[PDB]
Every structure is written in structure tokens, then in C-alpha cells.
Amino acid sequence: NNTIETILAHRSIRKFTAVPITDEQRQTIIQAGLAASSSSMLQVVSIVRVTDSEKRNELAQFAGNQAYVESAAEFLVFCIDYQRHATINPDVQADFTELTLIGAVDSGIMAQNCLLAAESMGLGGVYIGGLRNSAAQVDELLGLPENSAVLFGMCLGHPDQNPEVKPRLPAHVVVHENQYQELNLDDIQSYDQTMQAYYSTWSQEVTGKLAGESRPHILPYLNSKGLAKR
Template identity: 80%
Template sequence: MNSTIQTILAHRSIRKFTQQPIDSNQLDTILQAGLAASSSSLLQVVSIIRVTDKEKRQRLAQFAGNQAYVENAAEFLVFCIDYQRHASINPDVQADFTELTLIGAVDSGIMAQNCLLAAESMGLGGVYIGGLRNNAKHVDELLGLPENTAILFGMCLGHPDQNPEVKPRLPAHVIVHENQYKTLNLADIESYDQKMHDYYANRSSNQKQSTWSQEVTTKLAGESRPHILPYLNEKGLLKR
């Protein structure tokens, strides 16, 4: 097993950081790794906003649900769909197709994962912050995003000040299908639920008595940020 695979398999979300800054050369390498990511048709429809202003960091932490590590991490990056560049080149650009929003979301995820893996390969840690979408319009206004550009998620990066356990994932045979979709075997979920129950009960922090099925069905049983569609529509995206 090479060092790249080891880095990937050792991933943990880090939510507590030391006060040590990230070296400028390291940050540049992280960003260059992101820029090297695959891009659909080389459209390059992602923008990254590096937030260094302390007051803005504080407000972003509040907007994201009072997540203190947004404010305290050495670096905080915000990933955005961005078709404003293209519209500036040619006003005939039609950025409001659903397919183009999907491309922006997919490419942002690919770019962000490149950044995170690069950081983790240097001994740094990080965590994705989807909570920015709790208050998408406020975040958008704070960062001054133009038309055809919208926030997706943030990323904290820094030197880890915790060593959490690796969280178990569903087994590959549940996720990976061959040639066609196969019917779910609920016994596989029961086995995984027991593994997650043990993980939650025995991990070093935030212990709880729960299973994966309980967690995800609770999450999916109610509304999921219904304000996101009108937000994207207002930005000129996801209209048709």
C-alpha cells in the first residue's frame, strides 16, 4: 500500500486545531492541487474564497450554526459555483440550466477533495462545512458573490489538535453494483448498524447510543434546506 492510499484510508474530519498557521508554501501547494482537479469540458466553473478577515470568519461561524472551528482554523476556504467568469467573457452564456449547476457542484467537490487530500498528506487536517448553506444568502452577501455565482460549502484546514478514530463506512458490496442495481440486503445494514452503534458508544468524544439507520432516517425525515432552490434561482442558476 503506497502513501497516497494510506492518506485516503486514514481520513478523519478534524474539528479542533492548534494555533499554528499553515505555511504559505503548503497553502499554495494545497490550492494548486485543487486547481489540478478534473474539470468537465475544462469549463473551470469553481471559485475558492480564502477568508482571512477575523470578523467575517466570526460571522461565517455563526451562519454555519455556531461552529467555532470555522473561526479558529488556520485557514477557511469557501467553494462556489462560478459562471460569472464565463458570462463576463460572453453575455450570451446561459448559466441557468440544471446540468450546468450539477457540473458546478460536481467539479467543486472534486476540487475540494484534492485540496483536502493534499493537506492531509502534509500532516494537516480539515473538515467540510456544509452548514454555510443554512444561511446561504447571508454568506453570499458577506462574500460579495455576483450573479451566476453561488456558495456551496466551506472547508476548515489546520494543524490537528485531536486524534479522532476513523469512522466506519458501509461495506463495498453494499455500495458497489455490477452491471445493474442490486436489491439491498437489509442484513448488511443491520450488521453495519451494530458496527456504528459500537463506534458511537466507544469513540473518544461525543459518545452516544445510536445506529447509522437511526441517524440517517432522522436526518432525511424532514425538510432539507428548502431555501436553497430559491437562492440558486435568484443567482441565475438551476432554472430549467
């Protein structure tokens, strides 16, 4: 069917033309996102649509000079939001890590619906997690209140590049039957050879990134917004 063909044809697009996304298409992308499942129907996700060209230039820099944040037809920022709940009832305890986990999982579900809706219309896109490296600055720029935090952005627009589909680890590595199965390093070596053909190896690149520190300012940032304190 068309749904599965769309899911399997995905590739991140990082070059866009200047053709805008119509109001009808944008309203449909947001509705597709809203139709996503929500943990306990809590509805903990907020989207900040950035149209101001000066804020977009600042966001591209805050993302690590990723130019497509400025050139994209639409830039959406996904945020955890327990301020809606806190405004309704001030007795809400939003600082439990469980709530940040729900915020992250639900944001991913919603965002994927938005991206899939866009891709089905012939649009292209890419998630922007780079915003987290300058989290406090992005948070202030968007005026996010207490009980709210930035997670990632999303570029949407008409493609001006056609990259090849990137291979993933095989299903027998990622999927386990009944109990977790120990890793066979021969599968990692085969995947590394598959990635070298597409393009330092994959395993050497990813484990080398994790051998150092991974954005150490993230927990103090979440805590400063009143999230994940216990």
C-alpha cells in the first residue's frame, strides 16, 4: 500500500527549494501529528512554528550552523509541555523523570506522524536534535516557561536533492525473541562493510562519539525548567 511505500522510501533531506508549503498542507501535517497516540491522553507536546526570519537565522546557528534550518519552507520545534497542566491546576507535580520520559516518547510519536504526512505529499524533511547543544539559549529565544523544555526541531520543504536510502542494522540484530540475545560481532562487521559501500567505519564512528562526553549540560538544563529532578 501507499503508507508502507512512503515509510520505506524515507531519506533525510537537507537541501530545499524556495517554494512554500501551502496553508492546507501545513494544517494537514499538524492534524496528522495531533492524531498520534498520547500517554494517558495527557497531551504533553507543544509545537513552536518559527516564521520570523531573524529567529530562524539564530536557530540555524544554535543547531550547529545547519543551513537548512534557515532555508526550509517550515521549521517546527517540538517541546515537552506541562505548563498547560500547571496553569489549569497549580498542584501539578511535573518534576518526576517519568513525565520527561513521556514527553520524549510522545514527541517522537507525534513528530513521526508530521514527517510521514509531509513525505506522503512529496515534501522532504529532517529532524534537528542539534538544538539541544545550545538548549538554554534556544529555550530563552522561544520564551518557553517553567515545566517546558526543547527536544528537537524539524525542517520541512520541497526537496532539492535525491539521496539514496541508508541501510540499517538487520532485523535479526535489533529484534530479540522472548529474552535478550548477546551480540554477534560478525554482524557488526558485515554492517560496517555494507556502510562503506554506501559511502572510518560505522562502529568506529558511533562508539567513538560515545567514548567522550554527550552534552553534559542537559540534566542541569532540564532541572532549571523544573523537569526530571527525581
